[PDB]
Design a protein around this ligand. Structure first.
Ligand SMILES: CCOC(=O)CN1CCS(=O)(=O)CC1
Length: 185
């Protein structure tokens, strides 16, 4: 792909994070803590899952960023509406305002309803995410496999400002402690 020139500098928004997440001082890395991280509750925080939003809001244009997922067993990545539900149980679907892919139990799937199987021959260590707001497109790229396409959501109905979306996943196994990292431009 030739989307690299739309690169944007994404930072994480502390105030949206699940209370067990640890966001680095530079706001470029997030990981699961082993306990509550001693922050107050607020209506922005994701309560049920280890999720956080980027600070940036997008309502036009073309945007591209990359995320490092090295040695993780589970994660979700993509974009979501600024107004997604924060509290309680919900599925990641375009109907609920999410355009995402994930890794879970050794398989990759796109967050459609119902979910779609992805065909990845080279497990990615870094994922590229491209958003074209006007075209209604969200695309995912395998940076480890020379930028190969993973998945395209098309005919997206964003219906609001978009935020970068992250889930570091649960660490019940002891094998998913590694962080998500925003990779340099
Ligand atoms: C994020 C919501 O908190 C929990 O469900 C509690 N806990 C699950 C197992 S874990 O992922 O090892 C650490 C967090």
């Amino acid at each position: 792909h030739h989307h690299h020139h739309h690169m944007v500098h994404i930072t994480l928004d502390r105030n949206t994070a699940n209370s067990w997440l640890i966001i680095s001082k530079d706001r470029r890395q997030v990981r699961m803590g082993d306990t509550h991280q001693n922050v107050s509750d607020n209506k922005e925080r994701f309560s049920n899952y280890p999720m956080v939003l980027g600070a940036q809001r997008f309502s036009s244009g073309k945007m591209y960023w990359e995320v490092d997922v090295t040695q993780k067993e589970a994660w979700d990545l993509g974009v979501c509406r600024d107004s997604v539900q924060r509290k309680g149980q919900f599925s990641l679907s375009p109907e609920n305002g999410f355009w995402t892919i994930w890794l879970w139990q050794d398989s990759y799937e796109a967050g459609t309803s119902p979910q779609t199987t992805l065909h990845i021959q080279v497990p990615p260590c870094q994922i590229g995410i491209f958003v074209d707001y006007e075209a209604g497109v969200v695309s995912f790229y395998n940076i480890t496999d020379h930028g190969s396409l993973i998945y395209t959501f098309s005919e997206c109905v964003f219906a609001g400002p978009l935020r970068p979306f992250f889930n570091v996943g649960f660490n019940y196994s002891g094998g998913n402690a590694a962080p998500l990292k925003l990779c340099p431009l």
